[PDB]
A paper describes a structure:
Phosphorylation of CTD residues is thought to recruit multiple co-factors, including the essential and conserved transcription factor Spt6, which directly binds to and co-localizes with RNAPII at sites of transcription. The C-terminal region (residues 1250–1440) comprises a tandem SH2 (tSH2) domain that is tethered to the core by a flexible 21-residue helix and contains both of the two known SH2 structural motifs in yeast. The N-terminal module (nSH2) resembles a canonical SH2 domain while the C-terminal module (cSH2) is vestigial and does not conserve the residues that are normally associated with binding to pY-containing peptides that comprise the vast majority of known SH2 domain ligands. We therefore took an unbiased approach to map the tSH2 domain binding site within RNAPII and, contrary to the earlier assumptions, found that Spt6 tSH2 directly binds the flexible, 86 residue Rpb1 linker (residues 1456–1541) that tethers the heptad CTD repeats to the RNAPII core.
To visualize the basis for this interaction, we determined a crystal structure of Spt6 tSH2 in complex with Rpb11468-1500 pT1471,pS1493 (multiple attempts to determine the structure of a complex with Rpb11468-1500 pY1473,pS1493 were unsuccessful). The unit cell and space group were the same as the earlier pS1493 complex crystal, and molecular replacement followed by refinement against 1.8 Å data to Rwork/Rfree values of 16.2%/19.8% revealed a very similar structure, with additional electron density corresponding to the N-terminal region of the Rpb1 peptide that includes pT1471. The unmodified Rpb1 Y1473 side chain occupies the typical position of the phenolic ring of pY, while the phosphate is instead contributed by pT. The phosphate is displaced 3–3.5 Å from the canonical location, and is hydrogen-bonded to the Y1473 hydroxyl via an ordered water molecule. This allows many of the interactions that stabilize binding in conventional SH2 domain interactions to be conserved in the Spt6-pT complex. For example, the water molecule that bridges the T1471 phosphate and the Y1473 hydroxyl is anchored to Spt6 through hydrogen bonds with the hydroxyl group and main chain nitrogen of S1285, which is analogous to the SH2 BC2 residue that in many SH2 domains is a serine or threonine that hydrogen bonds with the tyrosine phosphate. Similarly, Spt6 R1282 (SH2 βB5) hydrogen bonds the phosphate, as it does in canonical SH2-pY interactions. The 3–3.5 Å displacement of the phosphate relative to conventional pY complexes allows formation of an additional hydrogen bond interaction with the main chain carbonyl of Spt6 G1264 (SH2 αA2). In many SH2 domains, the αA2 residue is an arginine or lysine that forms a cation-pi interaction with the pY, so a glycine in this position may open the pocket to allow the displacement of the phosphate seen in our structure.
Numbering used by the authors:
A (entry chain B): 1469 to 1499
B (entry chain A): 1250 to 1450
């Protein structure tokens, strides 16, 4: 049939290709 | 073939009719319907957002006759006893987790292009900060984009988070909450980053 089943897709993640220093916000308590 | 399924949410819809029926409904509403994959399958179609729908396969086992609903139902590789259990334990948890994500301060509404624009603008203003947001994947319902820049001059990376009924799946793990997903994303990237800097010689 025509209907898509998006729970069956697989989406590839781009590889991190840099040595740059990460500067994200802090981790936080999970609560 | 037209199966008589005795359930308050059963409609004999194709996927397009199901989406049309749900168009004016709210997030989390759904229909159960006949499958194009055969008389041992059903579909649950549910609404994530405006014009955004997901169709999930239900595999039937232990069928007493070819047209009757199987006494065992498989959804996303897990076994359920009946359609009400699927609604309660599969669908309603998935909707709960969708609302948790779209309620997060790390979630941005809009198309991918809209969110890239915000990320680029945010990076222009904060060029030495790493920036990341989640947004809805409109082309693959049930997924989120996880978009990030390391700094103003870095490329914009897109990773993919799958919504499940028990959490948010990213790379190798199903994070049970958005806070843990954010913490885990940072940990994962710190790990890959420190690996990139290793001296293999």
């Amino acid at each position: 049939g025509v209907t898509p089943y998006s729970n069956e897709s697989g989406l590839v993640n781009a590889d991190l290709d840099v040595k740059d220093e990460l500067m994200f916000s802090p981790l936080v308590d999970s609560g | 073939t037209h199966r008589v399924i005795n359930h308050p949410y059963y409609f004999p819809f194709n996927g397009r009719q199901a989406e049309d029926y749900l168009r004016s409904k709210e997030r989390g509403e759904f229909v159960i319907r006949q499958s194009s994959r055969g008389d041992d399958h059903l579909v649950i179609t549910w609404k994530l957002d405006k014009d955004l729908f997901q169709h999930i396969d239900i595999q039937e086992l232990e069928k007493e006759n070819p047209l009757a609903l199987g006494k065992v139902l498989i959804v996303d590789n897990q076994k359920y006893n009946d359609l009400d259990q699927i609604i309660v334990e599969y669908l309603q948890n998935k909707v709960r987790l969708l609302n948790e994500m779209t309620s997060s301060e790390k979630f941005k509404s809009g198309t991918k292009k809209d969110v890239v624009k915000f990320i680029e603008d945010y990076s222009r203003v904060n060029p030495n900060k790493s920036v990341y947001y989640f947004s809805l994947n409109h082309d693959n319902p049930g997924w989120f984009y996880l978009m990030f820049k390391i700094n103003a001059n870095s490329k914009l990376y897109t990773w993919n988070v799958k919504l499940t009924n028990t959490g948010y799946f990213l790379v190798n793990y199903n994070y049970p909450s958005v806070i843990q997903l954010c913490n885990g994303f940072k940990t994962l990237l710190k790990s890959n980053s420190s690996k990139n800097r290793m001296n293999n010689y």
